Amino acid sequence: YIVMLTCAVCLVTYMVMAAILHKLDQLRFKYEILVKTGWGRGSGTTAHVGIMLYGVDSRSGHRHLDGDRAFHRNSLDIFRIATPHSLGSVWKIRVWHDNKGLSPAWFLQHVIVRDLQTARSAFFLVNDWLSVETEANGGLVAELQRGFFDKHIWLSIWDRPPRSRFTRIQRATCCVLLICLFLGANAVWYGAVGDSAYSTGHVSRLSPLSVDTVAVGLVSSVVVYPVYLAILFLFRMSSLAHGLSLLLVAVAVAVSGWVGASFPPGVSVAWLLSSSASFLASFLGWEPLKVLLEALYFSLAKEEARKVKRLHGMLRSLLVYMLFLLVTLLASYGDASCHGHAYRLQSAIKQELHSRAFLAITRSEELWPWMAHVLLPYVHGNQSSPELGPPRLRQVVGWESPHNGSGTWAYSAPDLLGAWSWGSCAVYDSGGYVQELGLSLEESRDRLRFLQLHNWLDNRSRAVFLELTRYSPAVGLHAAVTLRLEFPAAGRALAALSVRPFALRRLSAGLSLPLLTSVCLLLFAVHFAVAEARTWHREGRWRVLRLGAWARWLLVALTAATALVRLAQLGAADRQWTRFVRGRPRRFTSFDQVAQLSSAARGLAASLLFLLLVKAAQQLRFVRQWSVFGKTLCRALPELLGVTLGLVVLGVAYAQLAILLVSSHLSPLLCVGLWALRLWGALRLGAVILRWRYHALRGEL
Amino acid sequence: VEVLLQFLEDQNTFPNFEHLAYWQIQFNNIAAVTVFFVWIKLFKFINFNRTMSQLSTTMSRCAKDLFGFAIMFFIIFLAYAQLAYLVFGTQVDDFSTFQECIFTQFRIILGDINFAEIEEANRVLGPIYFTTFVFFMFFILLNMFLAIINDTYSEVKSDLAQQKAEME
Amino acid sequence: SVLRELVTYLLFLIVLCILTYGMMSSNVYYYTRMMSQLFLDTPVSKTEKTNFKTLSSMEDFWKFTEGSLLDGLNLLLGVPRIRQLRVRNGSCSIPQDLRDEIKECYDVYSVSSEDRAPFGPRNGTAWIYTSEKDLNGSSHWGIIATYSGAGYYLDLSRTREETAAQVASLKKNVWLDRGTRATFIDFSVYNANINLFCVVRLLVEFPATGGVIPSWQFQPLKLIFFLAACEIIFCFFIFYYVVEEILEIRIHKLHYFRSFWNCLDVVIVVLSVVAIGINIYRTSNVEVLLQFLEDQNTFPNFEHLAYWQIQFNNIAAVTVFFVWIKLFKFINFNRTMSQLSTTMSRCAKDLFGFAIMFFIIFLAYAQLAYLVFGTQVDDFSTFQECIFTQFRIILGDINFAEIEEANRVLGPIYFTTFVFFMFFILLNMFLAIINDTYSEVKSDLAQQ
Amino acid sequence: NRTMSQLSTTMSRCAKDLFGFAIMFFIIFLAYAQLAYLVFGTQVDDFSTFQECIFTQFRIILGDINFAEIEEANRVLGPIYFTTFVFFMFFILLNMFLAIINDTYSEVKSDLAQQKAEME
Amino acid sequence: FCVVRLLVEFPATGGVIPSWQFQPLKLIRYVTTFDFFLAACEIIFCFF
Amino acid sequence: SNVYYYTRMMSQLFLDTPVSKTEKTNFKTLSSMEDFWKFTEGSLLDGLYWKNRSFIFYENLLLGVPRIRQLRVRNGSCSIPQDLRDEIKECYDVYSVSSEDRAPFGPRNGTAWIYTSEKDLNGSSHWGIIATYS
C-alpha cells in the first residue's frame, strides 16, 4: 500500500497533460517611447531584428520584424510588442538586425525610453555601427556569459523561448519517466533477492535514516543507471519515439509494484527516503551539471499574457496538493490497510468469546457464575491468544471487613494522562479501590469464593468492574478490554463492554512510518498558517465570516491537530511500555489510554482525507459546461438551508404529537434523523429551488 | 467430460468435479450479462411514435450533463465511505470492509438501517454522520439529479413546438 | 403592534412546550410497565406454557387467569370481579331439512340478542343475572361487538384465600356455559413505589365455533417548588385570551372572518376550551376517590373513572400541533419565512382538491382487498384495518408472501397495480402541485 | 370545480407521453429480471421463478430486502446488480416519471392563464 | 448432479467462519427429445 | 424450474439440522473448533447415509467417497519482540503460501499426516472469505 499509493499519486499528477496542453495552445521589459534613427544614409536593410535582452531571472528572446511597408529603402522603424520576459534596470540589453540584400552601412542611432522601468527615463544611446547583427555589449570563452540557458533542464521548467525550441508538453513526459525510474530502481536495491552476487545483500534495512549513512548513500547510486538511458530522450528533439517513454513507465510501475509486495515496514519508509533523496540528486546536482556540457562553445491581445500568470499559479497549487494529499493518504490509509482494518476479526473473537459478551447480564449478584466463565478460559488458555500481564478488577469509599491497622487501604493512585470515558452514571478515573490482582492460576480460581466470604460490595453510591489486555502475534496488534458494571441505585446493573484493538508502536528508537508523516503534516500546518498571515495581517482586516479565511483556517486547525495526537500516541506508548517491561509479569496498569488515543488519531486523519477529496470535486468547475453545477449549488444553499428552519418548527411538532404520546440528541436525533429516512415527502421540496436556479443559471450562460 | 468417464469405470475413488463446476459459475455469469445486453438493444428499434422519439431525444441529449454530475455525486459518496469505514469499521458488522461500506450507503437511501448500532458504536460523531448524510443526499444531491433531467425534458419539448408551430 | 400587543402568542408558548414535558414524568411510561410486568407475563406453573395472550378453551382459560390474579390479590385495593355475557338458547334459527345436526342457535354478544339466563345454583348473584343499576357500565365496542354495561359482578374478597375459595365454584358454576360470550375482570393498584392511580380491564373474548382471542386494557394516571405550579399560568395567559379573542368578534371583518392562518388559533382556542370547561364535574372529582381510601370492604369504582380519563390526556395533546403552526404563522419573521407560508397557504386550495381524488382511488383498493383477502389474511381482517395496511405498503412493511398465497392470480394483480399507481402517478402528482406553486410564489416576488 | 377540471385535463393530456415512457421503463425493468433469474435463480428463494423475480423487484423499491442472501449467493456480480439497480431506478427512471407530469401540469396551468386573461 | 463444498476457515485469533457451495450440473446431455432440441438450438445460436 | 427444489433441500440437510439432538448450533453457526468435531460426526453422518449404496432422501445417490482436506501453518512463522519472549513460547501466522507447513507430523502412518503438493493432488485454488487457499 505504501509502495502502491506513491506509485499512483505520482501517476495521477500527469493530469498536467491537461494544464500544460492549454498553455501549449498559445506557444517593464520594453519602453513604449518612440525610436527613430536619423544617421545612416543609403543603408536601409529590409530585414528583421533580434533583441538580446537577458537579465534578472529573464531571458527575453528576439523579435520578428513584421513590415507594413516592409521597412523600405532609406527609412527607420518604431513599434511596440509584448515582451513576455521582464528585466528591470539590469545592465544587459541589446539588439541584432541581420544583413539581407546588400550589406548595411547604417550606424543605428538609438531607441529612446520613457517607461523603461515603471515610468523611468534612462537615456539609451547606441550610436555605433555594428557587424552583421552585432549587439550592444554595454550596460543600461569569449562570450563567457553563455550558460544562461538555465532552463534547458527538466529542473523547474515552466519557461521556454517562444514559438520554437520544441518539447513544451513533451517535457512533462520526461518527468513521469524520471520519477518512476527512481521509484522502480530503488525498489530493486531493496529486497529483490534474485540470484544476484557475491555479498550483494539479503535484507538490508539497517536503521532507515535514524543514522544518516545508508538511505541517503543509495540516493547518489541509483541515479547513475537511468541517466544512462533517460538522457537518450533529449536526443529525440532532432511520434512513437515519445511512445516508448510512456511504455517505459508502464513497465516500471508493474515491476516496482511486484517486488515491493513483501517489504518489512522499515524497508518501506527507507524506500521513500532513498527515492526522495535520489530525486534531489537529479534536481540539485545532475540537472545542474547537465546544463554545463550541452553547447559549451561553437567557436571551433494584450490580456492573454495575464491569463498565463493565472495558469502558473494554478499549476503551483497542484504541486502542493498532490504532495499534501500523498502525505495524508499515506498516514491514515498507509498502515491501516493490511494490519489495522483487515483485522476487526481480532474484535470479533472476544465478542463471541466471553460466551456472547456475557449475554448482557445487567444484574447485581449475577456474574459470579460468569466470573467462572471468564477466569476459567483466560488464566490457562491452552488454545491461543496469550496473556500479556495479569488482569484485575477495580471498585469505586467504604471498604468493608475493616481491620484497618495496616491494610484496608486499596490505593489505586490515580496519576494518569486523563479521565476515562463516561457511562450513564459518571466519568470514571483510573483510581478506584484496586484490590484483586487475580493471578497464580488457582487462587484466582479460589478468590471467586474469597470475594464471597468477605463482602467487598454495596457502598460508595456507585461501583466498578474489570480490565484486561492481550495480543496475538500473528497480526501485529494488541487489544484493550474493559468490561463495565455500573451499579445504579435503581436498576440491578448497567453492563456495557469495550474492546479496543490497536498497534503498539512507540519510537523504534528514533524513526518509524507514522513518525515520518506526522512531521510532514506538521510542516503544512506551518506553511498554511503563514499563508493566512499574508492575507490577514496586511492585506485585509474585518475578516468576518468570509468562508475563505474562515475555512482555510480550519484546515490549519485540523492538520495541526492530526500530528499532535499521533505524536501523543507515540509518546504515550513508550512510557507505558517501559513501566510495563520493568515489572513485566507483575501488574495490569497499562494499555487503555494508548488505545483510546490511537483511534482519535486514526479517525481524525480520515476527516482530513475527507476535506481533501471534497476540495477535489470543488476543483472540477474548470470545465465550462460543468461549472453550472457548482454555482447553482452555492447559490441555492443560503435559501435551502432557510427552508430547513421552518421544517424544524414543524417537524419537532411532528414529534410533539408522535413521541409525546409514546405512553399514549438522544430521542430527538432518533426523532429527526430516524424520520427523514422513511417519510419522504419532506425530502423533495428542495427540488424546486435547484431547477429554478439551474434554469436561471443555464439561461445566463 | 473426460473426467466423469474416468470415474464411471471406478465406483470407489473420489470424483474431481471442482474444476468442472467452477466453469458453470462463469458460464452462468457470462450468459446472463449477454441476455441483459440483448434487451437493452431493443431500445435501438423501439422508436416508433412521435412520443417515443421525444423520450429518446431527452435521455440522449441529457447524458452529457448527467454524467458530469454523476462524478460529483460519487466524490461526496466515496468520501462518506472513507469516514464511516475509519470510524465504524471496528464496531459495526455493516461497515466491516470498504467494499461493504459502499453497499450499506445505498441501504440508507432505501431505508433498511436501524442505526441503533450506529449511535451505540460512537456517541457523538455517529449521528453527525447520519444526519448530514440524509441532509445532503435527500435535499441536495437527489434533487439535483431531478433538476438536470427536468430542464432537459422541458427544453426538448419546447424545441419541437418550434418545429410544429414553425412548419404549420 | 406586531411584537408588543402580539407578544402573548410567542412568549407564553414556550411555557406550554416546557411544562408539558416538565410535568409528564416517567410514571406514565416507565412505571406504567413497571406495574404491568407481573399480571401479564406470569403463567400458572411450569405445567402450563400458554399464558393469557394465548388462551383458547374454556377451562384452559381458567388455567390462564387464575394464577397471576392470586398474586395480584405494590398493594392493590377494591375487590375481585369475575363477569361474562349471558346469551339465550333459542335466539337464532336453523333448517329443519337437516335438523339432526342443530339443537340450538344464537347470536354474538349484543344488546338485545343476549338474555339473562339464571341456571341451577341460585344461592348467589353468580349464576343469577341482574341489571346494571348496581354496578357501573357502558357499551364497549372492541373488535367483536358493541357490548352492554350490565351483567352480574361476581366478586370475591381482597385476600387470595377467598379468591381461591370461589375458584372452587368455578368448575361447576363456571364462567363458561353453553352460551359463553365474554370474560372480564377489574383491578386498580395503589402502588407504593410510584404513588399513583391505576386501572385494569383484562378481557378474553368468546366467539362461537371456537374459543378466545384476548385483549388487554389499562393506562397510568399519576396522582400529581414547581410541582403543581404549572396550573395558574397555563390558564392565566389563556384567561385574557378568552377575553380578547372573544372580543375579536366585535371587530374582525365585522364578525365575518373567513381565513385559515388565523382561524387555526381560534379553532384551537375552542380546543383550549376542551380543557377549561372540563374541570367542573370530572377533573374536580374527589367523591370518586374519597370513597376509595375510606372503606376497605367495598370494591373499586375508579376503574370506570379511567374511562373518561383516556380522552382527558389524549385530547389535551391536540393543543400541541396547531399551536406550533400558528406560531410559525406568526413566526415567519424573515423574508424567507413569509415565502414558505405564502407557498403552503396559496397551495391548499389546489392541494385539497387532489386529496379527494387520492382517497377515492385509495378507498377503492380498500374495497377490493377487503372483499378478496378479508377471509384469509390477518392484515385485511376488517375494513378499518384494511386502510391502515395500505399505508404500510407505502412504507414497506409487508412481505405479501401471505398475499400471493391467499390468492394466486388476483393477489399480485392487486399488489403491482397498487405500487404502480401510488408511486408513479399519485405520489408524483402531489409533488407537481407544490412544485409549481412554490415556483410561482418565488417568481412573483422577483416581480416585487 | 374549476380546480377539478385542471386535474383531469392534466392526467388526460399526459397519458400519451406517460404511456410512452412506461414501455421504456419495463424494458429496463424486464432486463434486470432476466439477469437476476439466471444468476440468483438457483440459490435464493426470492428469485425462484421468473414470475416471482418480477415481484421481488418492486420490493426493492419499497425497501423490504436485506440482500445478505444476495451478496452471499454471488460475491461479485451480486452487488453489481444491486447498486446499478438502485442507481438507475431511483436517480433516473423515477425522476423521469416526475419530469413528465411536472412539465405537463405546468403547461396546463399556464394555458388557462392565457384563458382567464382572454375573458377580460 | 450436485457438487457440494463446505469450507470452514479458522482465522488467527481463532473463531470459525463457515461457507458452502451447492451447484447442480447437467453432464449427460443427449437423453430426451427436448435436450435434442436444445442441442439443435445451440448451433443456430452459433450461426447468428 | 426443477433445479431450485433440489439445491434447496440439499441446503436444508447440511445447514439447518443441528449438530446433535440436544444442541442448537447449525453448520451456519459454528463458533469453535470443538463445534466442528460435533458436526462432522453428528450431522454429516446422518446427512450422507440412509440405510449397499446411500440414497439421500431415498432418491439421490452418493458418488464414491468424500474427503477432507486441510491447510496448515508452520510453527516458526512470526517474529515476536524480545521484551515479552518469556510468557509466549511459540506462535503462528495468517495463511500465506510462504508460511505453510509441509513437514509430516504426529502419527505419520497414512496419507492424511503427510503433505502433498497441489499438482500431485488433482486440485486447484479457491477464493474464501479471508484469503485465497491453494
Side-chain angles (χ1 to χ4, degrees), chain A residues 343 352 386 471 473-474 577 584, chain F residues 31 78 83 86-88 92:
Chain A
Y343 301 102
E352 64 90 20
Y471 76 108
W577 186 259
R584 175 184 177 272
Chain F
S31 181
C78 183
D83 298 335
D86 293 333
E87 290 178 350
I88 300 98
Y92 291 100

Side-chain angles (χ1 to χ4, degrees), chain B residues 53-78:
Chain B
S53 67
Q54 184 180 1
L55 300 173
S56 67
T57 304
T58 303
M59 291 174 67
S60 70
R61 198 166 71 187
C62 181
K64 179 73 173 179
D65 294 326
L66 197 278
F67 178 74
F69 190 69
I71 301 169
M72 290 174 65
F73 175 73
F74 282 159
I75 295 170
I76 298 169
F77 188 81
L78 273 302

Side-chain angles (χ1 to χ4, degrees), chain A residues 500-544 546-653 655 657-660 668 673 676 680-698:
Chain A
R500 308 297 301 274
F502 68 100
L504 195 282
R505 61 187 72 188
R506 69 278 189 192
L507 290 173
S508 176
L511 196 279
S512 177
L513 192 273
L515 188 273
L516 178 65
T517 66
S518 58
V519 168
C520 295
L521 288 177
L522 194 65
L523 290 179
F524 290 105
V526 179
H527 183 274
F528 291 164
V530 168
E532 292 294 325
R534 296 180 69 186
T535 297
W536 181 65
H537 190 278
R538 57 94 180 166
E539 195 269 329
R541 294 186 185 274
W542 291 354
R543 188 62 175 267
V544 170
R546 298 289 296 169
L547 62 91
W550 182 262
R552 297 293 291 161
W553 185 258
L554 190 275
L555 198 274
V556 177
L558 201 277
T559 307
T562 302
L564 291 177
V565 294
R566 179 63 73 191
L567 267 74
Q569 190 270 123
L570 297 174
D574 57 349
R575 56 100 57 209
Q576 200 62 253
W577 186 259
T578 308
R579 61 98 53 79
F580 177 73
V581 82
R582 176 67 180 274
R584 175 184 177 272
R586 298 283 85 85
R587 277 94 177 97
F588 60 90
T589 60
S590 46
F591 296 116
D592 55 346
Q593 188 65 37
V594 182
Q596 189 177 0
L597 203 281
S598 176
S599 70
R602 187 181 66 242
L604 201 146
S607 66
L608 182 61
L609 191 271
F610 178 78
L611 270 297
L612 267 285
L613 289 177
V614 173
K615 189 182 262 78
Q618 178 174 356
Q619 197 177 4
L620 189 146
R621 65 180 184 269
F622 291 153
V623 178
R624 63 179 66 255
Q625 67 273 20
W626 294 352
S627 59
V628 175
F629 297 151
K631 179 60 183 291
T632 190
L633 201 145
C634 292
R635 180 69 268 166
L637 189 143
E639 290 82 3
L640 179 49
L641 267 296
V643 174
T644 63
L645 271 71
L647 195 277
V648 170
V649 179
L650 184 65
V652 169
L657 196 270
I659 68 171
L660 192 275
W680 63 274
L683 308 177
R684 302 298 297 273
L685 195 143
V688 196
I689 312 168
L690 270 66
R691 62 99 53 214
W692 185 66
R693 301 300 300 167
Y694 181 78
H695 184 69
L697 263 298
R698 181 177 286 275

Side-chain angles (χ1 to χ4, degrees), chain A residues 227-266 268-286 288 290:
Chain A
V227 298
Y228 183 65
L229 197 275
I231 295 176
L232 187 144
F233 286 174
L234 53 89
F235 181 72
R236 57 97 177 267
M237 62 184 284
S238 296
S239 66
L240 289 176
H242 186 276
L244 195 145
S245 176
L246 191 65
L247 181 63
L248 185 59
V249 63
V251 69
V253 294
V255 174
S256 66
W258 177 67
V259 178
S262 182
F263 289 170
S268 296
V269 72
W271 181 73
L272 271 301
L273 267 301
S274 178
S275 64
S276 68
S278 175
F279 176 81
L280 190 62
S282 70
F283 183 79
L284 190 67
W286 292 104
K290 184 171 86 271

Side-chain angles (χ1 to χ4, degrees), chain C residues 275 277 286 300 306 316-317 335-337 339-342 344-349 351-376:
Chain C
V286 176
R335 183 185 64 192
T336 63
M337 295 302 293
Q339 184 180 1
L340 300 173
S341 67
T342 304
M344 291 174 67
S345 70
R346 198 166 71 187
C347 181
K349 179 73 173 179
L351 197 278
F352 178 74
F354 190 69
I356 301 169
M357 290 174 65
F358 175 73
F359 282 159
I360 295 170
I361 298 169
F362 188 81
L363 273 302
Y365 278 100
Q367 292 298 112
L368 190 147
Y370 180 68
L371 269 302
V372 175
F373 296 154
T375 62
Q376 300 296 107

Side-chain angles (χ1 to χ4, degrees), chain A residues 430-432 434 438-444 446-459 461-463 466-491 493:
Chain A
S430 299
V434 176
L439 57 92
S440 179
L441 310 178
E442 185 63 28
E443 186 66 30
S444 63
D446 289 332
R447 286 176 72 187
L448 271 76
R449 282 83 179 273
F450 185 72
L451 295 175
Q452 298 297 105
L453 189 150
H454 286 284
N455 294 116
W456 290 94
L457 294 171
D458 193 3
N459 211 354
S461 296
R462 301 290 174 181
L466 74 152
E467 183 181 359
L468 175 61
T469 178
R470 68 176 62 251
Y471 76 108
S472 69
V475 299
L477 56 91
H478 289 260
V481 175
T482 63
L483 301 162
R484 189 175 71 246
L485 281 177
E486 284 179 346
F487 287 172

Side-chain angles (χ1 to χ4, degrees), chain D residues 81-93:
Chain D
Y81 169 78
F82 179 75
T83 61
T84 63
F85 184 74
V86 176
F87 193 87
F88 284 167
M89 291 299 109
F90 286 96
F91 296 166
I92 308 299
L93 271 291

Side-chain angles (χ1 to χ4, degrees), chain C residues 353-354 357 393 395-400 404 412 415 419-420 423-425 428-429 431-433 435-436, chain D residues 3-4 7-8 10-11 18 22 25-26 51-52 55 58-59 61-62 64 94 97-98 101-102 105-106 109:
Chain C
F354 190 69
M357 290 174 65
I393 290 288
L395 304 179
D397 288 333
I398 284 176
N399 53 2
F400 89 99
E404 72 176 0
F415 179 75
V419 176
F420 193 87
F423 286 96
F424 296 166
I425 308 299
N428 291 322
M429 191 69 204
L431 192 274
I433 292 171
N435 193 352
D436 201 4
Chain D
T3 63
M4 295 302 293
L7 300 173
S8 67
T10 294
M11 291 174 67
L18 197 278
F25 175 73
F26 282 159
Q51 192 177 8
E52 207 264 331
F55 302 153
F58 289 107
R59 301 174 73 239
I61 293 172
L62 304 179
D64 288 333
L94 258 291
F97 267 149
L98 192 274
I101 76 168
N102 194 352
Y105 182 76
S106 176
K109 185 181 181 293

